[model samples]
Target chain A: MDLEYMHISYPNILLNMRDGSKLRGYFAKKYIDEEIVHNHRDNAFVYKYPQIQFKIIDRSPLIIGIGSLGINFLESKRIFFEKELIISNDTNDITEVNVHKDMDHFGTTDKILKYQFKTPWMALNAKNSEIYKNSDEIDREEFLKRVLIGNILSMSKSLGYTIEEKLKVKINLKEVPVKFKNQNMVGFRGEFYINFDIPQYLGIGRNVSRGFGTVVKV
Target chain B: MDLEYMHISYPNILLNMRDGSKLRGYFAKKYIDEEIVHKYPQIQFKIIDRSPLIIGIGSLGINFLESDITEVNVHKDMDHFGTTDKILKYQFKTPWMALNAKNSEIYKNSDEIDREEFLKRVLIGNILSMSKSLGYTIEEKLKVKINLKEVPVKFKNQNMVGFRGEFYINFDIPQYLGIGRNVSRGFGTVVKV
Candidate 1:
């Protein structure tokens, strides 16, 4: 399984309301297969955790991006969504998209040192810990950056890229909570920069399938 | 002589004009007087290992400037006696593992030991060992950021199959601390990055 960066953009995606569950549900029901989803039944991988994510970018003209580890899942899901798209209570069709197996032409090639979170990035190492937010005590901002950087390296390794470089970080962020699974979760919407490179429209933090931390170049 | 990262940067370090030997050879001959060199068998500068490309010349009780230059250019060379070693922007690429039997057992027994744990143990041991030699106690725990990959390295006569990547540790440690397995023959000598 070649770990390549992939994104399926749904441009000008129309929706009745902004409901993450509805949006994610739309894909799980329509685009994703029951068997494949069952492979990650109850949202768990064999050993560690799920190696997949999604995002909904609302730039007035909405866009939906999916990043994952399994090529079969990505290929099959892209094919399913391309025919036509609908989410929760929305009825709109996306005619154009940017889908790929490699990401060479997305943006700058410099190594990523800082990443600015465009959406509230949420992550929890343990369920018992307070929802991470920027603060004096291992603030949400720092936690998100560490987790995101961790994800980037681990995902890159699975994708067959062993990245060994110095990572120095400084972030500026504020807490922004969003609802997930019918409950509110602490997330953040802010920006930071580093000396590394990552493609735009890629999911940044947790609950990516529900679009908690979608980022664009700033 | 707490090992903070240091490197002797002679941007255009001139070697011996007459002989095929480098300028560093002249400095090593002068600075590290005789008895200390041969008496300490664990030192890397043995005639057998004998590769003085860049000398990592300081430790707890040793300071290069502590001794007099005596005379510049014991042997004739256009440059000054020796280039000064400074603790500036120099970086070290030290890929180390715990050398103790217990740590080695965990490293050998487990499918793969936790890298962070291994790094923590290696670093603390190194720091305290140096601190003990310097006759000081270090109470603060220092955290360093490093990006390490498991790699294979060949050193001395045997093949050290398992090693760490070029670790850019954020902590300030002395350079030239021979680290990892087979360091006695210079397997993991820290180099300036």
Candidate 2:
């Protein structure tokens, strides 16, 4: 389908009653190249590695509403997987990356290439100011792509003026600052861009002032 | 604290949710290892991992969670903890090991320690052997300790039998018998030890 972008948060936590532990940090991991995203702000950002295996075990005590693990990507899409398979420790899996990759593909979703890159790429000019900053525009295009999936539909609508207009836009490497070490790194990191047609009328209404007023009268 | 051995069996289950999705294999993660206890049979292992934070915002929702992230000595059972107080990254983190050297001293009750290791030194061996087993004699005075936690001063009596017993010895580590690997290991290779 279409490429996408995401920036989520996670707390450092223990896995079980046993004692093994890892040190927690704002960014789940250290920068491999030190430049791409030496240290992202607000939300953790990285491009090279794949996203952690975002799973929601349906065997929860209360299926009151949505599933256990909450995420916009996987919703209504429920499964009562009677077989809660535990991929054996035949291989040493020190990182969550391993678990996520193995489970989602082997258990549920059809195998797809894994990609990661957090935040929208913003263009810059000679002045350190916002040079044609598409942060707001990119976020719009992103909204468009997300709603395609029911789980992300809410965001698609929220980030959009309506259906036809752009809701989300993909942020690219050009938006990344030169200081980023991961500039050379790949994945959806720099390419998963989208554009929310905020300026044009969504399939819904044309008479309306589409997106922000700044694009019109000003 | 004294040591008491307790045997508790947590059943492994393979739930056939009956929804035609999947219904096979036992959830053996409950107690396989003192550490992770999550996967011996992950299904039946009742204990659950803490949740990852999910804040409602205008931003596109992202998927995240660490099914296996603990700071404790995962493969070992000496003493441990997983979370550290330091906040480093902008992303949410599952429990990571709080490698604080001081973690060696989280204390507990005396009664608890006394009952930690349950099996007795002697009668344990005899129970396994069919016919001939040695018994404790008068000269050998073995002190047996029990949980004496604070409760009602007066305790009711119950029908029970307390017998004096002796153990073969106090040691551990099982020796192998004609081993390369246990018999469970497939037929031996060309160079058998």
Candidate 3:
């Protein structure tokens, strides 16, 4: 399965109330226009990540400003690969959300970093498989962008604080480009493509200093 | 020659302060006691790690916490050798902390599954350099136990909130100790001792 499962390893802030169950909030659209990356090596270099605005297309039943996917998700891996099959004109209802193949790999102290140097994204659309699959050679450069985006998004809280300290992050929801679509490699073969490059540093390393770009993901 | 420098990284509601400073913080101690590790993999599986618990031992001429050795840092590439002479106590002040060296390895993700049965650990501690300079050949298993009888006492907003989630996280000021002091390591300057 091309599923991307990010275990609720990060500091999952579980919203508690009078309910018997807990909620794992799903974000539909996100717009991270302003971000600053600080590198204190030879000299302190701060780079602003380019503007990004994308949405979770029909990924949810209703437009969720922010709500629980329901209680069943508790005691379950926080991050899951949910597939909502869509046809030509028919928006397919979400069938199921199974755990990603890499479920065991999900950890909170994740160190992720992405390098988007030149951006004009190339996007892909793949349907045959519900899980995310990566085909390194998509011709278009957007796959790089997607990997870059996902990598930056999955960094640990320890690293998040650095970015916050450097930029005092302010994130919100807005329609953003799904950017890249892929198939054939990470899963079944139906596909779409979108590509772009961002000249910025996306993530910082984890406790071990090995991040997506720095060590593994890329 | 110890100098003061400030490191600002990782900011959560509790980790970082409003003034852009980090109080004392604890790393996920890789070693877990049988009481805790008997079930968890981090210890039982020989997993988990002992990361750098960066605490501001001292800032400027001002004493932030108990320790005055704020500047006693062993840099990444440079071991204590080159920095031995120029080391100034409390010269540099770092406001942030994280899991340093050791378990922060790629195998931590990919290769841990390779090992089937590994011994469990009780408390976590990094390998301390042989303090052969201590003169006596006391093969002490040293740990940095820094529990001061008195913690600042006053709770900063960040401090109070952090302790709310994980209470034991209160051990920001790590106390080092030579747990198994002078354990058997084999003696004599030569082989045939």
Candidate 4:
């Protein structure tokens, strides 16, 4: 699949002191339009599963990953922020940011070798369900299998695509403890490559709109 | 990440057509000896959820169980126990289960038999016992997906509450790890997905 993405870099913004929760909050308050917060698009609120995924990646310098399956989303929202950003109230002068776009592929459409969840991949299966429960002591093999299964289905629904062919995938992730929605929760962190086709920089698992379950090439 | 797996299939066995009832009861009474009736071995026998549904035999030597099913006389009624069809066909997928992973105590309390702890014990205990049964040296890694449903089953002329769990594993394991409770009288058979 052909995937076009824009990487916006903040050269001067010091993000060592910030966490994903803070960054996610800053993005919603700043870039996301209040008018479209509750607007429904493709059944879900536009803000809930944003076509434009905003992420704050902590490398040597912080960078914002703006990804979309469609090119129109990037072309339209690309004009919102200035070329430079202040990041937060803690900064002094405006930090210069760089925006660059390129066409990329998911390496192999037949399989995904290893997609590292740079952030903890949050998985929340409800406690009560006709199929499975969150409290069930899911082993690593079954956990990974279901996660990828859910990912493909969720991605399809989120991207407005129909998956005619059943995709088989494998997962090998480490369990990580996290807190979401003010409750102690568990998340998985690891690098597992499987047989599924999707573009890079796509948000997956739970709370993708809030900067969790973000993947990147190593 | 380096992931290893093993998948085995039985081509001749038209599992979709056969009722789940007979296959389960027949598995024990035919294959498992009466001398070791209560000694439930850890092995799963179930169909994989995919096109041309595969009968994946996983875990350690649990795949060996497939060898015993080389022949089976299908019976429509449990009363007659008559042979209607014979199942003799099958294939394998590798590096099943965690043979060399680290083991740690998942639960601290051993005496707690609450529904939560009881369920946890049944699942982990099943995986652990099965791995050991096949002579695979390994540890208890917290990587299992257990989906259970409380179903009412007839037990010894009395109505009893039983659970039928649809288990999916992360590490490679055999398909039908006998779930819920009883394996002696065919109460906890893994239903095909």
Best by DockQ: 4
Ranking by DockQ: 4, 1, 3, 2
For candidate 4, write residues B3-117 as lDDT tens digits.
Answer: 1223344545554321234444554567666323463443334433321122222233234444433743311111111111221111111101111112113222322212333
lDDT of 1 by residue, B1-193 (tens): 2232223223333333212222224444665564243411123321112223233333522333233223221111121111123222222243343354566566655322243446546754654564455345554554433334465443333433444444433234344545444332334455446
Off by over 4 Å in 2: A1-166, A170-189, A196-218, B1-24, B27-193
| DockQ scores of all models, one per candidate | 0.02, 0.00, 0.01, 0.12
lDDT of 3 by residue, B14-117 (tens): 22222222322212233232222111011101000112222221242123222222433322121121112121211001111111234223213532211100
Docking class of 3: incorrect
Question: What is the lDDT for B5 in model 4?
Answer: 25
True contacts kept of 3: 0.00
Give the alpha carbon lDDT tens digit for every residue of A133-179 in model 4. 33344434455566667766776665555566655554556677777
- Candidate 1 per-residue lDDT, tens place, A142-196, comes to 4665766665564355445556665544455666666666777666667655554
Angstrom error of the Cα, residue A102, model 2: value is 46
What are the root-mean-square deviations of the candidates from the true structure over C-alphas?
13.8, 28.7, 24.2, 19.2
Error of 2 at A123 (Å): 2.0
Error of 3 at B103 (Å): 28
Per-residue alpha-carbon lDDT of model 2 for A1-218, expressed as tens digits?
A: 22222212112221321011111111123323322223243466432211112211111111111112322222322212211222223222222111111111111122222222222222222231232332333233233234222212332333331344322322223233322223422111143222221111011111001110011100
* Chain B TM-score list for all models: 0.48, 0.13, 0.18, 0.41
